[PDB]
Amino acid sequence: GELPEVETVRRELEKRIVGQKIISIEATYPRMVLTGFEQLKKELTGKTIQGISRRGKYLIFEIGDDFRLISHLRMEGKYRLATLDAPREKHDHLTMKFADGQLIYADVRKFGTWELISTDQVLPYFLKKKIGPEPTYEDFDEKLFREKLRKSTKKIKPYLLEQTLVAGLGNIYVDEVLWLAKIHPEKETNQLIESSIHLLHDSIIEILQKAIKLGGSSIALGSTGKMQNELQVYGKTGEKCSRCGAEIQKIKVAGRGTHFCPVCQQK
DNA sequence: CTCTTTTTTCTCG
DNA sequence: GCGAGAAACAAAGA
Ligand SMILES: [Zn+2]
Questions:
Q1: Gap from A158 CA to C2 C1', in Å?
Q2: What's the record's note on cofactor binding?
Q3: How far is the CA of A207 from the centre of ligand 1 (A)?
Q4: Phi and psi for A139 in degrees, rounded to 5?
Q5: Are residues A112 and A155 located together in one domain of the fold?
Q6: Is A166 exposed, middle or buried (0-12, 13-18, 19+ CB in 10 A)?
Q7: CA angle at A13 for the pair A11 and A14, rounded to the nearest 5°
Q8: N or C, which end of chain A has less CB nearby within 10 Å?
Q9: What is the DSSP letter of A137?
Q10: CA distance linking residue A86 with residue A80, whole number of Å
Q11: Are A73 and A6 in contact (CB under 8 A)?
Q12: What is the CATH number of the domain that holds A240?
């Protein structure tokens, strides 16, 4: 669940639940509500959903007039809109019941989280998380990006995954971005020349923007994406690179599975 | 049976 | 502060 997948979920939710009054909230796994489930149930029951926003890989439900429910899907979180009589599935943990349907949150690994905070605490919340800029030409400044890369000895893939240089990249799109920009994942950032940094900056924006347009990569809301048919290296071990023909290899970098073309991504 | 594979954040040294 | 390794947790494959 990287930025593209989260944005796809945000869009579907925006089109379907905005304006809906929450009738009741139930939980079989209350511990995933970091701010306290009973407190959330008390505060949100009877309130109306005003909108759905996103920051990085974080979903933000705008409920009532001053409430903000921050939701992170982590690795396996999935939302689905179902009928009120829908049977329970093994990994369903929370449900927001409406008059003519319910929003169910499921997460096999139980990594996902819910946090209820106030409207004026959202900006501070993300500053504390140290989340970087959104991947858009408007917010992602190439100049600062370049300066941070020049001052570090960190490897490019692990650094990009930190969410500090830019928000939204996960294992899938970081591998796709580096292949597009012809940069090896273990390259120390202070070794990147200006032309490469420029290509990388543009590629981060292009790949993520393309993934959003195609509804993310599907493998519930959002399982309609088509980006998985556009992947050039992630999970393509042993296949031929679409540019040079060499076999895509898979190695481990900072503990993460890493796919790359040994020819196009030198070093 | 064991070992490995698949976002965020903390413990070590 | 950093890098290495791993925990949180569940399922499936070698
Ligand atoms: Zn290649």
A1: 13
A2: Binds 1 zinc ion per subunit.
A3: 17
A4: -95, -30
A5: no
A6: buried
A7: 65
A8: C
A9: T
A10: 11
A11: yes
A12: 1.10.8.50
